[PDB]
Ligand SMILES: Cc1ncc(COP(=O)(O)O)c(CN)c1O
């Protein structure tokens with residue numbers, strides 16, 4: 001019976017959506033989005049994907065079910081993108097990929113797999129990290145502990161505090177790492193920090209779990225993977241949850257992949273059969289559309305050439321706004337040092353605004369942002385940069 | 397670590413797939429499919445859906461995320477199809493629909509919702525029923541008990557045994573019902589049995605859970621819903637998991653819906669917020685494609701006219717094969733009475749063959765079928781009907 005059922009809380013970011021689409025003062029800027037927007041403030045469907053879709057519309061002959069792990073071409077394409085084209089992990093066949101409904105679905109299936117087939121109990125999530133991370137692991141029954149990460153003072157990665165908090169984790173604990181473009185800080189470890197982390201991860205016996213939802217948004221496709229590749233060359237086992245939502249603009253088609261890595265082909269096949277069991281009990285088989293689109297794009301090099309360009313254009317727009325944000329702030333005039341913004345990668349960063357400030361921002365100006373002071377840089381156009389910086393400067 | 401991980405068992409139906417796509421004697425007939433096939437043994441993508449897809453390809457401007465509950469038009473369209481166009485449940489706004497990845501995803505989200513927000517512990521599944529049913533509820537942590545159903549002697553619905561086993565269930569237990577086209581028997585209650593069941597369900601306090609994956613395959617769209625509608629007019633609460641996989645031929649796009657019914661708009665909104673919380677922790681938001689296709693078809697009456705015809709054609713083909721199966725068997729000559737086949741609805745039925753027989757069927761003839769003697773009627777074409785009936789007759 002449902003009458004004494006507790007109403008679910010307001011999702012941190014969803015409340016904003018509604019308040020924004022209510023604010024009758026149209027000079028309003030929504031910075032708590034999470035999705036990429038072009039200079040027009042529009043989230044378009046990539047040309048490569050549209051071409052890909054016409055191709056599928058012309059060539060599909062059936063809608064019959066995919067296998068639990070999805071379209072195979074999609075699988076090999078994802079692990080090549082992740083580990084590199086000549087990666088030993090691929091050659092020795094010690095990796096297996098299951099196509100899943102978005103990066104979140106990949107995280108849930110990993111969670112269920114881990115919860116039913118191993119003795120992992122705790123999962124270490126960075127502080128801060130994407131909020132849905134806790135809920136995902138919690139629903140699988142795993143407990144979430146947090147390691148330090150953000151130096152609120154210097155707006156940086158507090159490595160010392162970081163390694164110092166991980167020492168609290170036992171061998172057997174799963175440690176969640178953001179591949180690149182840390183959500184919500186945009187601070188990523190340098191390659192040397194990744195390596196010390198890889199080294200320490202082996203000595204302490206953690207099971208690395210990479211959340212890779214922004215490949216291509218920090219430096220490039222290969223560059224962004226260098227961190228995970230540092231771990232994958234040092235570990236016998238690891239799990240990587242990747243999303244194609246942002247980098248292919250396929251948000252609503254739900255396309256991601258959960259990749260398993262084990263010591264050998266024999267062991268990976270045995271563990272993968274159970275991961276497939278977890279999928280069958282969840283949604284049975286994955287949604288073919290978004291994945292078909294990614295599979296055909298990445299495999300037709302004419303189409304892959306166009307996509308790559310569309311992604312570097314996306315990446316560069318974001319980098320121009322982080323850059324243009326810093327100095328438009330220095331023109332509107334305020335005691336500051338927002339240059340830390342330029343050092344950060346991806347669509348996000350903590351502006352360093354107090355919840356009090358972010359509040360008067362929404363209230364007195366119509367500039368919307370998430371309470372944590374997290375701001376989506378892709379929500380800034382060269383046009384709305386001025387009023388944005390004026391408002392920000394007027395609340396400091 | 398994964399080295400001591402147990403290999404998952406062989407899925408009952410998947411083993412067949414491989415053995416079939418190996419049998420070097422091409423006179424082979426695979427009857428353990430589960431998907432619909434036309435007279436050519438092909439699972440085509442409906443014309444209505446192809447038209448729908450060209451329309452979407454022409455009109456989509458973004459791939460931005462859908463809400464946790466999916467496309468709203470899709471939602472109202474599903475509840476209208478389920479409850480009727482003037483249903484009080486719709487007018488009083490006591491139903492809420494979440495678009496989900498297939499009917500299986502709808503069952504898992506219901507499972508999670510029920511497992512976290514209520515005190516339901518056991519779920520009553522018919523014996524027999526679709527095998528993935530147990531795994532779905534089990535993964536949510538619910539226990540599955542079974543009520544009688546199939547009269548193996550008279551190939552019928554043993555109502556007496558049925559109601560007699562349900563008396564074992566406490567008020568508060570969830571009782572799983574197949575809307576129409578019972579999988580794997582094809583035996584559905586008559587409208588009078590549904591009503592006694594609705595009546596008894598209220599007196600005992602069960603929470604009905606309808607698995608509605610074959611709407612339109614037994615008698616028609618409305619006719620097939622009359623059972624659930626008998627329950628929905630008598631209950632204050634119920635949950636219905638529906639799939640568009642079969643009836644729209646959208647198998648791999650993963651399109652289904654989990655509908656919640658409560659006493660009033662206030663309570664349904666409060667419980668639904670938690671169902672949405674369960675979705676967010678699972679896959680975040682649903683796959684837009686297959687659902688967009690269903691939403692546009694069902695709402696453009698030119699397109700809906702074409703789809704309906706495609707569905708009645710599918711339904712009628714199946715009915716012609718159940719009919720032509722019965723007498724082709726009576727021409728090949730055998731002591732029998734397979735007329736029970738004609739009484740059954742949908743793509744399935746238990747032929748009544750022993751596992752020993754179904755075995756020599758695969759082995760000595762290349763006729764594949766699931767161990768339970770379940771046979772997918774849509775796998776029979778007017779062409780392969782002869783050798784099929786010869787083989788069957790040669791093992792009786
Ligand atoms: C860091 C991070 N991880 C995982 C996800 C998963 O996204 P999706 O389901 O849309 O791929 C997101 C959502 N943006 C994310 O920001």
Ligand SMILES: Cc1ncc(COP(=O)(O)O)c(CN)c1O
Pocket residue numbers: 283284430497498499500501526574579607609638639640641647651652
């Ligand atoms: C009775 C029944 N219930 C639920 C499902 C769910 O199917 P899907 O995920 O493909 O909608 C099926 C699979 N055919 C089924 O046969």
